[model samples]
Each structure stands twice: as structure tokens, then as C-alpha cells.
Target: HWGYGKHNGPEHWHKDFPIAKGERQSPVDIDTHTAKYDPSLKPLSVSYDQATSLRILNNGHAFNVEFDDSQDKAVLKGGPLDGTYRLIQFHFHWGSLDGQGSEHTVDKKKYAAELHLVHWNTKYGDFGKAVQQPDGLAVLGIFLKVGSAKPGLQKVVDVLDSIKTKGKSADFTNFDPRGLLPESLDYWTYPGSLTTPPLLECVTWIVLKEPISVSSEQVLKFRKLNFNGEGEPEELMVDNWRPAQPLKNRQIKASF
Candidate 1:
């Protein structure tokens, strides 16, 4: 059933599984690490082509955009990021009104929110099937930090009025989301698992070190999502982020 009436927030999301405290989650505090991270790398380039279409999905928290990038004119290639990977879905990871902020981290210093640009190897089939294979997924993570204010995200935030209600998202006809890229593309890459379940371990992560800034108030709006009882006005949808997990034996590579 393609419905958003159920499984709206993180609280009421588990109907078939047991909840575990302190699970290996993401968006944790990224603390300290060796300052000797690779520095010879150049800023990776990120460019998106015109989106043929954009579909809005209301799977619970807020709205996500599933846009067609097969027609993606822009490409981020060469260096660490090789091959052609097209964008499929765009979503966010946020925190409550106060603490928590990122998805993946280096040592332990968590940011504010992380935006995920899910892509797949065009050599494979559709995103659903490609997402299953280890070589099929390529995710771009951009960190969000709290600051005085940010205009870079106005492109995304300004659209909230149209989809404030859960399960109410629209197709962004003729809108190419690629126009919202930051001027810099330098990033950190690694092999990691999807933050969400199936928790597949086939993702090639490209996390940009240069974070995009947003106001505290705007982040507050993200916390105000209607995910409570029926007819209950949407409360602050803050704390929508998962804490960071151990990198285990993972070695992060930088291309900056």
C-alpha cells in the first residue's frame, strides 16, 4: 500500500521489530581525529543535470525528493569518485530541538544535519535493485551546521509550505534540483553501510567537508513535524537524526 498515513516518525516507526538503545546509529558528535588527514586532494566537482521529474515522498518524517537523474546533465567524476552515478533520492537527517545532528562521523564531533544524495551505478538496473549490490550505491553526504543564518538552503526550505502535511508531497515538474550545489566539491570518501535498514553495506560514501549553514530557527522548523496522535498538531520534528557509530576498521580517505 503506497500510503503515508502510517509509520510517520521515528517514535511510531517500529511495529515489527524490537527497539535497541544505543544501536550503532549515525549523525553522532564528530569529535577529534588526527589533523594529518590527507591534504593534497583537490575539491571534487559536483554538477547535476536537468531533472526530468521530481517526485515527493512522505514516508513519515517529512518529505523527500525522488528525482530522475538519468537525464542528469551534471556529473562529479575523476579522482576518488569515478564512473557515472545518477541521483535517485534526496533526504535529510536532523536532531531534536536541542542536541544531536549528523549521520556519519570521523572521531566524534557531530554536526547539525546531514543531507544524503542517494545515487546508483547506471550500469545496473533501477535504484531498488541496484541498492542491493555492493557496487551499486554511491551516496553524497553534506553536513549542516548551526550558524547565524544560511541562504544556500533556501531552495529547499522555501518549498515546505506546499508539503507540510504528512503524506502530502508533489512532483516538482520541470525542476532540476542540481542547481543547488555549493561552489566547492572537496570531500571525504569511504565504504560504509546505509544508515537505515536493511542497513546494506554497499554504499560508497562521499562526504563533503565544507558544510552548508542553516539558522537555528530553520532547524527548529524541521523539528516541528506532525507525527503525533491524530488531529494533534504537528510538534517540533527535531531530533530526527541518529547518533554516530564507531567507524570500526574503516579508513577514511580525503580528496581535498
Candidate 2:
């Protein structure tokens, strides 16, 4: 029911999703100087089995790579978390151009795009059940810069041809998630909500300090997909991102 158009954009989201203005909202403007360094924070760890990648889909909002989270075959641990979190899906946000799409900004500087790897805490059971509780989810945020093409993203880009239209989906497997990550593990952490509707305040955001690379051409290809379903006037699926929210009394922790 929410979208990134002039009439239905982030400013108007509170009309349908009241939690959009709630405390602990996500995609905040992260100012590094204000973030507190946490020497006690443990290094984040991820374990993913290539077999866990099930399929990829263009669900009208954004393209997503779904995982088989029925088992702990793909999971996240450490950092600012209290328990294990299973990887459920991975998705992206981009603008019509190179400088406008990322939901979270670094010191007010915007990136070309952003990637979200969604996970749910195992301490609360399944994703559905965990989403309603505080501290139930953890989302890894990776910024995308306009530079050299990321070799790890080729597999994902290749399948975009099959799912260009909204609601289209295709089988996807044998892809390793690790290859898509930046070499550095340093990050900024904070408690926040989902960037989209329902805006649940369950996500513990782990935004990486370093950005990954993607060519300008590669970023433009993402904008070519349609937001509308078959037989509808096609709307480009670009700028599918929420704006930054207020930080309130929250502290952004840094893992140096």
C-alpha cells in the first residue's frame, strides 16, 4: 500500500502505516563522530550454505533473493546480537540516478544504492513470530558505490532478465553470500525498524563502514525493471527507498 512516488512516498507512509513515525525507526543518518566505539563488541560472523539459496523474485517493491531458512544453514552471529539469526532474504534499493537511492546516509552523504540482508533471531523462533517482538531481527546493510562492477553480483544480475516484470520469479541456487560482502568487517550498529511498511521496530541494524563496488551501468540496469504487473502501464522500479528517520535518544555504536 506504500510506494516511493510523489503522492505515496515516505512522507505519506504514516497514513497507512502508523508505525512509520514511531521511535527506533530505521535508515537514520549515521554520523560517525557521534557514534561511540565499543571495544567489547565481538566480531560479527556469518555462515551460509550455497544450497540455501532457493529463488529470486521481483515482488513489485524490490527484487529479492530468498533463502531456505528452515535450517540454520545460513545464519548470522556475534556483533551486537544476543543470539543466532537466520538469513531469510537479501534485497536492494536504488534510485533512478547514481546519487539518490540509499535509505541510510553516512554523515548526510548518499550512496548510489544499498543492500539489505534480512535475518530473524532464532531465540524467538520463526521469522513471522519473531517480527512482532523487539530484538527479533537483524539486517546487514551494505552501501553500493558507482565504480568497478562487483563480480559477486553477476549471478544476481543475470537472473534479472527472467524477473524484469513485477511478480515474476525464478529458481536460484548455488550462490555464496560471503562473496558479496566487503573485505572489512567494521560497522555501525543501532536498534531500528524496517524501512518499509509495518515499519516494525524489531531490526538491529548492522551497517558496514565500507561500501562495495558496482559499475554505473550495473546500477542503471536495476532501474530498468517494472514496478507494475502484466498488462499495466509500466512504472520504473527506481528510487524504492525510505528516507532517513530521527535518531531520538538512540546511540549509534561503532565496531572499529
Candidate 3:
């Protein structure tokens, strides 16, 4: 029932989801000048097991490569988190144009797109139960800039055609997500929520300072996806991103 369209977009989310108006909402603008440096925050650690990667699906909003999260294979800890978080799935958000797309902007500058690697804290048992806990989720955001083509992105881009329509999925295994991360792990972190609705207030956001490079053509391929299901009204999947929310007197810490 919810989508990124005019009638039911982010602005209209609060009507169906009350927490959209909550204080800890995500995709906030990270102003480096004001972000405080925290010596207490540890460096972020991410480890992914290639065998855990399951399949890729076009869930109508965006395409995501789901991982076998039933086991404690891939984990994300450190950097403002206390417990180990398991890798759930990874997805992207983008705009119709290159000028803007990323959900989280740095110093008011926008990138072509953004990637979210979502994880759930194991202490809460599973993702369903974890979403209600304050420290239940950890999300890693990576900005995608328009630059020289990278082979890492090509692997995911290669399968876009197979899952062009909503609900279509392709077998995706032995994919190590580490290939998509930038060299430097320096980041800005804060307490936030899921960008999409039921927009839960259960996330600890870690947005990387460095961005990865992707060709303009590679970004163009993401638009080929259709938001509608089979035999439904066809719509190009573009601008599937929520605008940055308010900071609400919160603390944003710069990584070491």
C-alpha cells in the first residue's frame, strides 16, 4: 500500500505510520562541521561468509540480494554497537537523475545513489523481534558516485535484467559483500530508524565518509527495473529514496 509516488510518498508516510514523525528517523543530513568526534567509538568491523548469500529479488521498491541470515555467518560489530549484528540483506536507493539520489547526504552534497547493508542484532533472536528493540539493528550506508567503472558493481549489475519485474528473483550465491565497500572505513554514526515504512526506530546508522565509484551507465541500468507486478501498470523504478529527515538534537559522532 506504500510507495515512492506522489499520493503515497514519504510525506504521506506519517498518516499510515506514526513513527515517521518520531525523533530518531533515518536518512538524516550528516553535517561534518557539527558532528562531534568520539574517541570511545570503535572502528566498524564487517565479515561476510560467501556461502550465506542466497538470492536477489525485486521487491517492487528496490532490488536486494538477500543473505542466509538464519545462521550467524556474517557479522557487523563495533562503532557505536555493543552486540554482534548479523547480515540480513543489502539494497540500493537512487533517483532519476545523477544530481541527487542518496538517502544520507554529507554537508548537503548528494551522490548518484546509496547502498544499505542491513543487519540485525543476534541478542533479540531474529529480525522480526529485533525491529522493536532500541539497539536491534545496524545499517551501513555507502554513497555511489559517478566516476570510473568498477568491476565490483558489475557483478550485481549483471543480474538486473533477470529480475527486471517485481517479485522476480534469481539465484545469487558465493557473493562476498566486502567487494562493494570502500577502502577507508571512516564513518559518521548516529541513532536512527529504517528509511522505509513501518519506519521502525531500531537502527544504529553507520554512514561511510568515503564513497565508491560506479559508471554513469551502471547507474542507468538500475532504472530498468519495474515497480509493478506482472500484468499490472508498468512503472520505471527510479527515485526510490526518502529525503533526509531532521536531526532532532541528536549526537552524530565521527569515527576514528
Candidate 4:
């Protein structure tokens, strides 16, 4: 597997993952200069709650969860967002330093960290089933670079110790993500595929122009998450992020 055979890494990936060839691979750099902007992409509504119908399942390699909210008071739409996408799953990517961790890159540069709030169109009923359809996934990408302290995320980070184990998770009772969102809801959007496997091409991607802050301790805790198992070697998974890909002439639009 190490040799440069026909089944080499890149060759194998290109062969097995056909969607990788598209110009839409994630963790790309977003240039504010070249942004195709619309000023109306602001929040339709914003709501906060003590919790959600949320459960975190440790997939051994990562923590995955489904969050399908029916809060009419909290919604955002238009452009690639389509006004109908409901939040499904939210996940994280990180790095060892403040200068890394973003899954999408721009012009070959990386940021400190990235968080994805994955959603899907509501036509498929809920996020549980919508994730499987062609036009079912909408992912909001938020950068988490080093910044000043913000208490909004304490609601999320407070429970980190509870889910510290590789496969250990619990029902995250009384949680609302609206508090953690950046104040400036402005964003850039484009049509792209999921960054993960199956790499479904139905995703409408929204990249927030502003970013949130994560303290060093929080970042370090995130960096130390185990992907293997309970007793396996704990690797510094801090910088687990995707490198920026070629834009391939793709033009992305933004909302200021």
C-alpha cells in the first residue's frame, strides 16, 4: 500500500472517489475580494433553546449527531440556502495552531479551525432522511480561528468532558446553537458536494464571512479527541482538516 502502485493513495482516492475530481472539493479559501455578494442573506429568524432532539453517537473515528429542529422562530434561507434547509448535523475540524484547521481553503491557505453546521432541504420530511437524497444536504461552514474570549460556546464546551471517550456519548439535553453563531450572519455560497464519503453533490454550501472564537483550552481539548477506541493510543488529532482544493474556475457568490 505504501508503494506507488496502481492502487496508490491519490490514484486509489481518484478511482474510488470520483467526486474528488470536481472543482468543488471543500476547505477552499474564500476571498472577500472576489465575493459575489448579496446583502439580504441575513437570518430570517434566530431562536435559542435549552436543548434539542440531539444525540451524539461516537462513530469511533469521530462524533456524529443528528439535530433536526422544527423551531419556526429560527430559520435562514435564500441563494444556495434555498430557505428550506433544516439543520441536521454539526461537526468540527481543528489544528494545532491558530493558523490551521479549516476544511476548505482559499488560494491554498488554511485557517485555525472550522465548524460545519450540516442541514438539508425540508422536502424530505426531516434531516434524518433528507441526508440520503440528492438535494438533501446544506452545510454551513464557519471558521474558528484564534480570537478574543467569547462565552457563547461555553454551553457546548462545558459538555466536552462527558463525551471525551472515543465511543462515549450522551444525550445533550438543553442546548441551543443560536448563541454560538457569529453576529454577522453574512455569507458566501455555492453548489458543492459533501466533504465526506459518498461525497454527494447535492450540497448547497454557505460559508460565513465572520468567525467565532474558541479558547486555547477548548481548542486543546478538541485537538485531543480519540478516533480509535477507549484504550488505544491518543493521537493529537488537533489538525484534522482538509487541505484547500483547486477552484477549477468555479465562481462562488456571497451575501454581505
Candidate 5:
């Protein structure tokens, strides 16, 4: 298993994962000045049924909210996508403290945190099968700034205590992920890979320009999570983000 630590961090992942150094890696720096505007990009069409939210879990690497993606009950379409993508799971990447945890940067400035909503293209069969294709996945990323407390996020934070240790999960339902997004759908798009291994180069990145707000207290709650299971030395799960990767021979398409 790969982890973000002194011995197995991002810099050392390429030795084992190989694809960690893939040319189309994720978390690239998006500079608005250089991004080309695409007039044909459609507005993001999102339909999420709160009932489809299945559970919340501590996967050790990061806390995630898994969806019942058996069908297209919750889906994302438009905005650089050729077909509808089914929502599978959503997770976060944050630092041990405020002001520096986001994987992607805007002109070299890091955000307090970042949220990734992972979806797989329905036309390609299932997530497993879709993951292998070049256009198989679409990840919508929302940046989180440290500011006022977000009431909509409180529900997720409330359950963290129960799943503090690795591999722990709790039943969670009726949570609408829409509340976590910003008001603006304007975004930037590019080709990229999964930030973590196997680091498949299958994602069409859709990164929002506007950021949402979260409290400093909520940020602290994430640090309480453990990278190791109970009874280990208890390494705190913080700064679990891969630094921005190179953007070679790729053009960033902006939807404004």
C-alpha cells in the first residue's frame, strides 16, 4: 500500500508505481492567463439524488463519502464530457494546518484544502472497465478556503469521530454533495491521471474557479484521523496531497 510519509511520499512513489511519473499526471498548476477559453464547453449538468449517498469511511489515506453507483441515479454531464459520468466516490486532500493542503495550485498559490468528486463514464461499462480508457473518468475539483464555518459540511464532520481509524466506516445517507460546491460553475479542464497510484491517465479534469469556505475548526477535525489502524504509533493523516505535476504538451480549456 502507498502512503504519504517520510519513506513513501510522492517523490518516492515513482520507484514503485512507475506511472507516478506519467506525463499526464494530475494536480497541475492552472494559470488563468495562459488557459485558452473554449466557447463550446457546456455548462456542468449535475443531478445528484441524496438517497444515493451510501456511506462514509476512513480509507486511511483520506476520508471519503461513497455513493451507490450501481446505476446512474446520481450523474455528472456536460462541461468537457462526451457522455454522462456516474458519481462513485468523493474525498478530500488537506494539510496538517490551514493555508496549504490543496493538490492543484492556481498560479502557484495553494488553497487550504481541496475536494474531489470522482465519477466514471457510464458508456464504458463499470468503473473498473472505464478506468482503463483515456476518457473513462471525470473528476470535479473544488477548492476550499479557510474562513467561515460551512454548515453544510458539519454533517460530514460529525461522523469523523466514529471512523477515526483506518478501514473504519459508518452508514451515511441523505447527504447531498451539491451543497459543497461553489456558486459558479466556471472552470478549467485538462487531461490528467489519478493523483495516487496506479495513477491511470484516464481523467478529464474539471477544476472550479471559485472556492468554497470552511472553518479552521473543521480543518482541525481532519488532522485527528489516523493513517494507521488503532494500536499503531498513530500517525496523523495530514498533508496527504501530491504536489502539482508538470503540464507537458497539454492545453488547459477554460469554461467561462
Candidate 6:
């Protein structure tokens, strides 16, 4: 099983998933100085139906809030997206500490953590086929800063105790995930891949410029997770993020 351990971590992922070395990879550093202010890019449009939320699970790598993707209830459009992309799940990536955690840094400044909202294009008909297209998926990346306690994020943090170990899950329903987003939709966009392995270069990366707040205590709750599954040597899930990848001449566009 692939994981964030010394043996099976990001560095070793290329051994199994060769696409890890491919161009158009994700989590690129946003060099605001170099990002082109594209006047053509429109503000993003996102709508979520709380009833679409289903459950939360600790999948050993990262815990995700899974959704009912069978319909267009929770969908994302506009911005860099070509058409409608259905919400499949949303998850977080953070360090054990309050520093050096976010995947996409701004001009080399790392935030406390990051949240990824994963969606797949409805045009592809299914997630499986979606990954095959370069423009099949859209991931909205939001940075998490250590500040005030967010009532919305705290809801997810409170449930971490039930999923203390990998493979553990619980019913998490009727939650409006949009409450976690910053008021500003200002963002940087680039073509990239899934941050995790089998990292198909199918994602249209949309990283929000504004970061939301989560108390330092809330971040510590994320550290309580175990990288190792139940009945194994316990290892805290920390530094579960991949470093910034090469831009490889890909253009970064900004919505100003």
C-alpha cells in the first residue's frame, strides 16, 4: 500500500507510479511575480447541496469526506473549468506542526496546512474514464492558516477521534463544506495532476489566494491520526505532503 512513510512515501512513489515524474504535476509554487494576470479567466462558481454529503474515512494516507457523486447536486464550474465537474470528495493535507505544511506555497511561503476539494468532470461520464483526460478533473486548493477556531472546520476536526487510525470511518452528513472557504474567490490556476500517486495529469489546479483560519489547537487534532493502520506499530500522521514540483514551463494564470 502506498503511504507517507520512508519506504512507501512520495519519494518512492515513482517506482510504482511512473507518472509521478511526468510534467503538468500539481502543488506548484505560485510565483506571484511571474503569474500572468489573465483577464479572460472568470470568477469560479461552486454550489454544494448539504444532502450530498455522506461519510468521512481515514484511508491511511488522508482522511476524506466522501459525497454522493451520482448526481450534479454539488458541482463546480466557471474559472479554469471547461464545464461542470461533480464533487466526489474533499480532504486535507497538513504537517504535524503549524508550519511548513501546505502543498502549494505562495512565493515560497508555506502556510500551516491545505485543503483539497476533489471533483471530476461529468463529461467523462465516470471518475475512472475522467482520469484519462488531461482536463477531466478540477481540484480547488485552499490554504489553512493557524488563527481563530473555525466553526465549520472544527466540525471535521471533532470527528478525528473516531477515525484515530487508518480504515476507520464514521457517518458525517448534512455539512456545508463551502463554509470552510474564504469569502474571496481570487485564485491562481495551472494545469496539474493529483497530489497523491497514480497522480494522473488530469487535474485543472485552482488554488484560492485567500486562506481560511483554523486554531493551532485544531491543527493538532489532525496530528492525532495514525499513519499505521490499527494493530500495527503506531506512527503519527505528520508531514503528509509532497514538496513543490517543477513548473516545467507550464504557465500559471491568476484571476485578479
Residue 210 local lDDT, model 6: 96
Q: Which stretches of candidate 4 lie over 4 Å from their true place?
A: 1-12, 39-53, 68-74, 106-109, 126-134
Pairs of residues at least 3 apart in sequence or in different chains that clash in candidate 5: none
User: Which clashing pairs does model 3 show?
Assistant: none
Model 2 lDDT, residue 207, Cα: 97
**CA RMSD of all predictions:** 4.7, 1.0, 1.0, 4.0, 1.0, 1.1
Candidate 6 stretches with Cα past 4 Å from truth are none
List, residue by residue over 200-223, the lDDT tens digit for candidate 3: 999999999999988989999998
lDDT tens readout by residue for model 1, 64-112? 8777666655345544555777777788877763345577665665777
Can you list the residue pairs that collide in candidate 2?
A: none
Give the alpha-carbon lDDT of every model: 0.61, 0.90, 0.92, 0.65, 0.91, 0.90
lDDT of 4 by residue, 135-218 (tens): 777787887867665576665666666676666887864556776688886677776777655456677778877888878877
Residues forming the 10-long window of minimal summed lDDT in candidate 2: 43-52
Q: What tens digits encode model 2's per-residue C-alpha lDDT throughout 13-67?
A: 9999898889899989999899999998998987775437889999999999999
- Candidate 2 regions exceeding 4 Å error are 49-51
The Cα error of candidate 6 at residue 163, in Å, is 0.9
TM agreement with the true structure for every prediction: 0.77, 0.98, 0.97, 0.82, 0.98, 0.97
Candidate number of the best lDDT: 3
Q: Give the TM-score of candidate 5.
A: 0.98
Please give, for residues 27-112, the per-residue lDDT of candidate 5 as tens digits.
89998899999999988887875427889989889988999998778899998999899999999999977868999999999998
Clashes of 5: 0
Best-first order by lDDT = 3, 5, 2, 6, 4, 1
The C-alpha local distance difference test score for the whole of candidate 1 amounts to 0.61
